[PDB]
């Protein structure tokens, strides 16, 4: 992680297996019940988009929900792009560039890149932003798929 309490500069660490393994057991014991969201955020202490992608990937148990979460990530990522016109284009290759949806999501950003955004004047919380989009995906799942009936 890195964006924990921001009291870390270019500093970074790989998600402790303790924490990662914890995510697995969490969804393993509780599935997608409403409590899957809170524990997710807890085991996501301002981490990098990759670390987050790792977590999701770790417990991507069934394509059913993973689809709902995927569709949402994509839509949010695209929305970000809508209001981020790259204002007349990122003319000339060599600039750090404004983070794009696919970049914040991790698909088109390198681990180093993500670090760069998380350690720059003004810090672009790529991981934190992405962590918000994922949660929107999780809570949409939970809503339209979680409990049984009026028991």
């Amino acid at each position, epitope marked *: 992680p890195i964006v924990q309490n921001l009291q870390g500069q270019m500093v970074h660490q790989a998600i402790s297996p303790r924490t990662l393994n914890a995510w697995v057991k969490v969804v393993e014991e509780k599935a997608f019940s409403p409590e899957v969201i809170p524990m997710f955020s807890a085991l996501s202490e301002g981490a990098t988009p990759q670390d987050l992608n790792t977590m999701l990937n770790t417990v991507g148990g069934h394509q059913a929900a993973m689809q709902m979460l995927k569709e949402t990530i994509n839509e949010e990522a695209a929305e970000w*792009d809508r209001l981020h016109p790259v204002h007349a284009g990122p003319i000339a290759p060599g600039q750090m560039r404004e983070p794009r949806g696919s970049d914040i999501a991790g698909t088109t950003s390198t681990l180093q890149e993500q670090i760069g955004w998380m350690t720059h004047n003004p810090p672009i919380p790529v991981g934190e932003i992405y962590k918000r989009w994922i949660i929107l995906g999780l809570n949409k799942i939970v809503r339209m798929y979680s409990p049984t009936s009026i028991l």
Partner: antibody
Amino acid sequence: QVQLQQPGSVLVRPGASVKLSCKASGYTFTSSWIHWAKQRPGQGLEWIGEIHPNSGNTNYNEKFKGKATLTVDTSSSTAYVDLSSLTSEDSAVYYCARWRYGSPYYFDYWGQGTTLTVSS
Amino acid sequence: DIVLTQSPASLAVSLGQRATISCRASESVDNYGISFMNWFQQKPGQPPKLLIYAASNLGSGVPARFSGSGSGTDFSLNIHPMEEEDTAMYFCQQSKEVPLTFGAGTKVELKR
């Protein structure tokens, strides 16, 4: 029952300015981006711009950049557009539309629109 | 901006038949496997009405009669079966680049 209520009609003389409103109701104003669209009778919809109540971020259409200024008043759930140096051209129906806060993004609610008349 | 060219200015669709209007963007309105081309309808005097979002996703409370299709640069709003009340103006808008743009519209009139 999210209500985007805005003035029926407005008459101003050329060279003046007018601040059109759009008193949002029903939903939590700071959730969605308010957009503004102009449409001259017998014509399509031009995009004036958009603004986000909880941040003041805006995106104006280069065309209107210089004519229209988007504002808001979170306190009283109302978005505004101030049209400068009004001329006969500006006479068109001005709609205010909410951009849904959720994943499926698109214009989900429209105000009935205010008709402007810039005449002598 | 990112221009959208709508095919016919007007189109007379006989009742029960199929109305086909098309919208062509100067650029691909695609992103993350999503064609962000929306279709709206408009009755004289009132504000627009979303029919189809995401190029083919029907909106809420829009009769199945309205269908969407397209990808990247070419899109089409297909009405079938065409019913009387459908006399309206139709526009397509790209929800892809910051300066959202609209089409010049198509006037779908019912051929009686």
